[PDB]
């Protein structure tokens, strides 16, 4: 029945120059504000359409009709994350095999085994802030990223990146960041010899990542040690379907994937949650009151983290306004009609624009830009597929429980131990890589002088 709107075009380049910008997701959100719930986005060689309403995304989330697509962004990241969970297609044998093997390591129950390692890193964060001098401040996303990288290293392969001991990045990290950057940069360009150097550097970075991870795996098998880490489960697990274990090359890709998937996504969430708390002091007060009520011991237990309900609402309200992995891609499994109005062909692509979904006034009411964690008080009232910050169905985030347990523990501890001051009246500036984060967000903390165990 209807023709899809489309944003402004640039002759032969179609819509491509619209993503030639430091902040493409935020540019796409303004397009959606103008064009509405669905728009066609064309590039040379390719077309996708971006969805922004709960009414159409609830249909895109029908797994009988649509499966996960590798967006052009993920295709580029697949050049180094290979067939790990995030960059594999659903129909590749290593997807279902690794998904079956790793699901038991990522459940709510499994979080009891990672809890003590998470605490070890959260205590390092608290001690860093306790030890600042009166005149100093905190570089919020920088310190969040030290906690989240350390927590994934320790829980994922018993490796200490010791990020609180340094300001220079780990070699793996240098190459990872630079490969992510190149993958991001390729979205925009239009094979010229001007890129011979980008190409050589990318190859060099892929080799550094593979060499360093292949050695962690070799070391582990050579030593025989059993930890409560992901690497142990991968080396010992068998997929109950095929009966097969993962091989070493696939294990290497799962480890690279954990670092690409489970680190800056969670540090972004912690940084946005802090930003909203300091911009909303009544919400900060209510969250700090819960942390004081619940965290009655020198360090938090697993069960006490589960009891930080309001802190959990705070994190979901940050994920509502700024989901840190802001889009995911799908393809039509068969010809079908979306919303009774937009016929799609088998293989056609869709993009779910999560921050715009989360602004659907028909779901959230008119106060959609307000930070109000109490929206999440009776979650059964939320319609299906309205709130999707960890994606969809069997291709949802396998790390969801991990990220929320880490973020709830850390933000609980921060709220127990410090008062916070937005001393610069910081203006939100969201920096975009594949993921979102507040850039330049700084605060001052004033210790409540409560001892740690
Ligand atoms: C607040 C933090 C996080 C957010 C918002 C988040 C978001 C998401 C989203 C939106 C997807 C689906 C992407 C797609 O459909 O293309 C996804 C997939 C995934 N995430 Fe996360 N994630 C976070 C934390 C983590 C953590 C901590 C880990 C690992 C420890 C992780 C590991 C993965 C993996 C491996 C997948 C692919 C799962 C599969 O397809 O089988 N994530 N994530
Ligand atoms: N698991 C949250 C990270 C995440 C989801 N989708 C992604 C796509 C590319 C990327 O580098 C990272 C991601």
Q: Which CATH number covers residue 420?
A: 1.10.630.10
In ligand 1, the atom with minimum distance to the C-alpha of 403 is 27
Closest residue by Cα to residue 60 from 366, 336, 372: 336
Q: Is the distance from the beta carbon of residue 265 to the nearest atom of ligand 1 less than 6 Å?
A: yes
Asked whether 351 and 48 are in contact (CB, 8 A), the reply is yes
Which ligand has the shortest distance to the CA of 154?
Answer: 1
Quote the DSSP letter at residue 36: -
Give the H/E segment covering residue 337. strand 336-338
| CA neighbor of 72 nearest in space, from 178, 177, 187, 176 | 187
The response to whether residue 66 sits with its C-beta less than 6 Å from ligand 1 reads: no
Is residue 19 within 8 Å of 187, Cβ to Cβ?
yes
Residues having CB within 6 Å of any atom of ligand 2: 73-74, 77, 180, 260-261, 265, 325, 397, 399, 434-435
| 447: three-class secondary structure by DSSP | strand
**Ligand 2 centroid vs 211 CA: distance in angstroms?**
22
Domain hosting residue 370, numbered range = 1-453
State which approach was used to obtain the coordinates: X-ray
Q: Which residues are annotated as a binding site for heme?
A: 397
Residue with tokens 């070391």: 219
Residue with the smallest CA separation from ligand 2 atom 6 is 325
- Buried/exposed 290-312: b ≥16 CB within 10 Å, e otherwise: bbeebbeeebbbbebbebbebbb
Number of compact structural domains in the chain: 1
Cβ distance 14 to 6 under 8 Å?
no
Ligand nearest the Cα of residue 324 is: 1
Residue 265 Cα: closest atom of ligand 1 = 2
For ligand 2, pick from 68, 72, 84, 261 the residue to mutate: most ligand atoms within 8 Å of CB: 261
Confirm if 400 and 146 have CB atoms less than 8 A apart: no
Distance 73 CA to ligand 2 centre (A): 9
Instruction: Give the closest ligand to the alpha carbon of residue 78.
Output: 2
Which ligand 2 atom sits nearest the alpha carbon of residue 183? 11
Using alpha carbons, select from 19, 76, 82 the residue that is nearest to residue 198. 76
Pairing between strand 436-438 and 138-139?
A: unpaired
How many whole angstroms from 66 Cα to the centroid of ligand 2?
19
User: How much distance in Å is there from the Cα of 4 to the middle of ligand 2?
Assistant: 28
Give burial (CB, 10 Å; 0-12/13-18/19+) of 248. Answer: middle
Q: Is 125 in the pocket of ligand 1 (CB under 6 A)?
A: no
Count of other CB atoms within 10 angstroms of residue 242: 12
CA distance linking residue 400 with residue 386, whole number of Å: 17
Task: Tell the residue number behind the tokens 């080799």, with chain if given.
Answer: 207
Cα(376)–Cα(7) distance, rounded to whole angstroms?
34
- Span from the CA of 102 to the centroid of ligand 1 (angstroms): 13
Resolution (A): 1.7
Give 3 Cα–ligand 1 centroid separation in angstroms.
33
Walk across the sheet containing 138-139 and list its strands: 138-139, 442-447, 418-421
Place of tokens 């699901």: 103
- For 67, list phi and psi in degrees, rounded to 5: -120, 165
Q: Whose CA is nearest to atom 7 of ligand 2?
A: 325
Task: Looking at the CA of residue 230, tell me the nearest atom of ligand 1.
Answer: 30
Annotated binding site for (9Z)-hexadecenoate: 50
Q: Give the number of the ligand closest to the Cα of residue 260.
A: 2
Residue holding tokens 């310190």? Answer: 143
């Amino acid at each position: 029945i209807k023709e899809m709107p489309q944003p402004k075009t640039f002759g032969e380049l179609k819509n491509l120059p619209l993503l030639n910008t430091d902040k493409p997701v935020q540019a796409l959100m303004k397009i959606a504000d103008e064009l509405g719930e669905i728009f066609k986005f064309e590039a040379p060689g390719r077309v996708t359409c971006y969805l922004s309403s709960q009414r159409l995304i609830k249909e895109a989330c029908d797994e009988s009709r649509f499966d996960k697509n590798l967006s052009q962004a993920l295709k580029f990241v697949r050049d180094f994350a290979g067939d790990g969970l995030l960059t594999s297609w659903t129909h590749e044998k290593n997807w279902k095999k690794a998904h079956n093997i790793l699901l038991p390591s990522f459940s709510q129950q499994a979080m009891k085994g990672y809890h003590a390692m998470m605490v070890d890193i959260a205590v390092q964060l608290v001690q860093k802030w306790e030890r600042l001098n009166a005149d100093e401040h905190i570089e919020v996303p920088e310190d969040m990223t030290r906690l989240t990288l350390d927590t994934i290293g320790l829980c994922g392969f018993n490796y200490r990146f010791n990020s609180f001991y340094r300001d220079q990045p780990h070699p793996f990290i240098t190459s990872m960041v630079r490969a992510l950057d190149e993958a991001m940069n390729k979205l925009q360009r239009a094979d010229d010899p001007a890129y011979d150097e980008n190409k050589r550097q990318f190859q060099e970075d892929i080799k550094v990542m593979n060499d360093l991870v292949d050695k962690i795996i070799a070391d582990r098998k050579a030593s025989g040690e059993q930890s409560d880490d992901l690497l142990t489960h991968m080396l010992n697990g068998k997929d109950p379907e095929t009966g097969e274990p993962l091989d070493d090359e696939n294990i290497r890709y799962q480890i690279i994937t954990f670092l690409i998937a489970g680190h800056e996504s969670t540090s972004g969430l912690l940084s946005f949650a802090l930003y909203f708390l300091v911009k909303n002091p009544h919400v900060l007060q209510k969250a700090a009151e819960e942390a004081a009520r619940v965290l009655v011991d020198p360090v938090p237990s697993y069960k006490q983290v589960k009891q930080l309900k309001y802190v959990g609402m705070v994190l979901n309200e940050a994920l509502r306004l700024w989901p840190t992995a802001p889009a995911f891609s799908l393809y039509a499994k068969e010809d079908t009609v979306l919303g009774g109005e937009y016929p799609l062909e088998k293989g056609d692509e869709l993009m779910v624009l999560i921050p715009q979904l989360h602004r659907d006034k028909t779901i959230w009411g008119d106060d959609v830009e307000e930070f109000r964690p109490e929206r999440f008080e009776n979650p059964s009232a939320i319609p299906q597929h309205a709130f999707k910050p960890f994606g969809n169905g069997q291709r949802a985030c396998i790390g969801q429980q991990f990220a929320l347990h880490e973020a709830t523990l850390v933000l609980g501890m921060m709220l127990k131990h410090f008062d916070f001051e937005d001393h610069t009246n910081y203006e939100l500036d969201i920096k975009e890589t594949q993921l979102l984060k507040p850039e330049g967000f700084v605060v001052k903390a004033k210790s409540k002088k409560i001892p740690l165990g």
